[PDB]
């Protein structure tokens, strides 16, 4: 007897790192994802790894535009 | 209005959080009565332990 | 099911808006060419310019400039200087092009 | 046909006791009204076994009403195999869709040969006028052989009744019997062990 599986990868801490109505600064992360489960709304960018990050010192906000996807914004102050 | 809360069962054996409620209210002993204002917050924990507490509406 | 006309229209424009600047939209008909400057965050238009509403003649190209020069003329008055140029489903060429050439003369910056 | 049954309203009462009070919670509901009722589970049972979702049932409401309706749905205690709720459909003088029964008359040829009649559908869905509700729909099944089948197309519809399904639907069939002779051979049946869907570079 013996096994041939027993291997795995280190969980990557995926998910959202700042929620709607939550106060962030320029450069913080807003979503950690694989693919574009969310999209860069306003004042928000996205990096080579679909990582969303604020672009100004604002206030987070989400938006479900149906077929168009779920976007995360940053309305300033 | 105000609420008079009496601790009638022992929290010994219920989760840490409920023991915190009895702290929030101020109940640190059995039979201990403690009269409190009737806000929603207070009225919140007070309900979290009503399986341990006997409540009564006063003044 | 979209049409190559529909698609080409979106990608050229969804990209534009990402710069958040005012958008110069251009429409090109068989007879006339129109142009309205838009603010896609307030969902409202400002200054309009079109051959049709300008009683303009035949040379579609030379027209485009006059609608171009005109559009810039009425714009700057409203303190509109910089702007983004939407070529829509139309390649930057001739009528569509020549128009922008005029607007750039009128004052608009792009 | 057309039966009857007392129905009483409810509201703040709680379905837990009711069905222990001997009463079956229910609702009346069309495009115009919508009220919560309840019935002596026993009384209504003696009706539904005869009526089902097929025959008309007017509720003798305590307010004085007496509305014609049909049953659109009956929810059952899956565990205890028993009803726990019913929906009476305020049947108005408008055209409606309902299940009309079927009685398969004639002894199919297959039966005489040893086959069986798989009465697939036992009622048919149809649009109709409640005034124009038939009692049932004959169908000849004498000329059926193993394993001939029959459809909604082969139905011969009375007046005012109009199918609410695609005639390509099937509604009966004669199939072979359970035969011991098939057993012994079935015993020595060799079934190659299940194949597992390959994965990764093995496709």
């Amino acid at each position: 007897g013996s096994t041939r599986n027993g291997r795995d990868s280190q969980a990557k801490r995926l998910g959202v790192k700042r929620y709607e109505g939550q106060v962030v600064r320029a450069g913080n992360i807003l979503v950690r994802q694989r693919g574009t489960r969310f999209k860069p709304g306003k004042n928000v960018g996205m990096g080579r790894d679909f990582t969303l990050f604020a672009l100004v010192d604002g206030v987070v906000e989400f938006q479900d535009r149906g077929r168009l996807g779920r976007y995360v914004h940053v309305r300033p102050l | 209005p105000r609420l008079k809360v009496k601790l009638v069962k022992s929290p010994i054996g219920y989760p840490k959080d409920q023991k915190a409620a009895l702290k929030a209210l101020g109940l640190r002993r059995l039979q201990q009565e403690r009269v409190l204002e009737d806000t929603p917050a207070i009225r919140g924990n007070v309900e979290k332990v009503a399986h341990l507490v006997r409540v009564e509406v006063v003044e | 099911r979209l049409t190559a006309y529909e698609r080409r229209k979106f990608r050229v424009r969804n990209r534009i808006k990402r710069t958040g600047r005012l958008r110069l939209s251009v429409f090109r008909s068989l007879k006339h060419i129109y142009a309205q400057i838009i603010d896609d965050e307030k969902g409202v238009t400002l200054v309009s310019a079109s051959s049709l509403a300008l009683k303009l003649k035949g040379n579609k190209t030379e027209v485009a400039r006059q609608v171009g020069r005109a559009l810039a003329e009425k714009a700057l008055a409203l303190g509109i200087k910089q702007v983004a140029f939407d070529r829509g489903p139309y390649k930057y060429h001739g009528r569509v092009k020549a128009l922008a050439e005029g607007a750039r003369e009128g004052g608009l910056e792009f | 046909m057309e039966y009857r049954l007392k129905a009483y309203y409810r509201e703040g009462e709680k379905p837990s006791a009711l069905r222990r009070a001997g009463k079956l919670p229910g609702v009346m509901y069309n495009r115009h009204l919508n009220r919560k009722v309840y019935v002596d589970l026993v009384e209504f049972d003696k009706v539904f076994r005869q009526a089902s979702i097929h025959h008309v049932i007017v509720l003798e409401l305590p307010d004085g009403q007496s509305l014609p309706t049909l049953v659109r749905q009956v929810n059952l205690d899956k565990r205890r195999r028993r009803p726990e709720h019913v929906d009476f459909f305020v049947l108005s003088d408008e055209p409606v869709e309902m299940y009309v029964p079927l009685r398969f008359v004639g002894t199919p040829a297959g039966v005489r040969a040893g086959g069986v009649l798989q009465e697939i559908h036992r009622d048919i869905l149809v649009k109709v006028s409640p005034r124009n509700i038939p009692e049932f729909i004959e169908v000849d099944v004498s000329g059926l052989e193993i394993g001939d089948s029959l459809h909604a197309s082969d139905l011969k519809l009375p007046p005012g009744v109009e199918l609410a399904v695609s005639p390509e639907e099937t509604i009966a069939a004669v199939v072979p019997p359970e035969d011991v002779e098939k057993l012994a051979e079935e015993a020595a049946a060799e079934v190659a062990e299940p194949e597992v869907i390959k994965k990764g570079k093995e496709e």
Partner: protein
């Protein structure tokens, strides 16, 4: 006896048998049926046992419907072995069955022929059974 023909995954876990039947509590085809009053992993060996029992009480005739299918792989270690060293090998498949589910139906046959055969088919089950008739409750479903 029953079992799939092709599978995505060789080994399922064990899940659980909590709750009433998710579905299959109501006569769908045949005239009478056999219902489950308590849960279990019913093995295709078992199923085939019921089946054959009824088909033979019908001698020739009748029609039997099997509304449960063993799609769960039942695994077990070798013999006398220790714990660990991978998961056990498959030794037959079972059919999860929860209360109120109609495991078998029958048609084309008398009443004191389906009643009996079902009673016999019920003694080949590791659980308790309840012989049922087709109710309009069924038909309204």
């Amino acid at each position: 006896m029953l079992m799939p023909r092709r599978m995505k995954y060789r080994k399922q876990q064990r899940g659980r048998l909590k709750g009433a039947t998710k579905g299959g509590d109501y006569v769908a085809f045949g005239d009478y049926g056999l219902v489950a009053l308590e849960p279990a992993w019913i093995t295709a060996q078992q199923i085939e046992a019921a089946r054959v029992a009824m088909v033979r009480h019908f001698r020739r005739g009748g029609k039997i419907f099997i509304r449960i299918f063993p799609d769960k792989p039942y695994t077990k270690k070798p013999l006398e072995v220790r714990m660990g060293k991978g998961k056990g090998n498959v030794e037959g498949y079972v059919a999860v069955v929860k209360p109120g589910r109609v495991m078998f139906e029958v048609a084309g046959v008398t009443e004191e022929q389906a009643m009996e055969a079902l009673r016999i088919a019920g003694h080949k089950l590791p659980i308790k059974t309840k012989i049922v008739r087709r109710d309009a409750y069924d038909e309204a479903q």
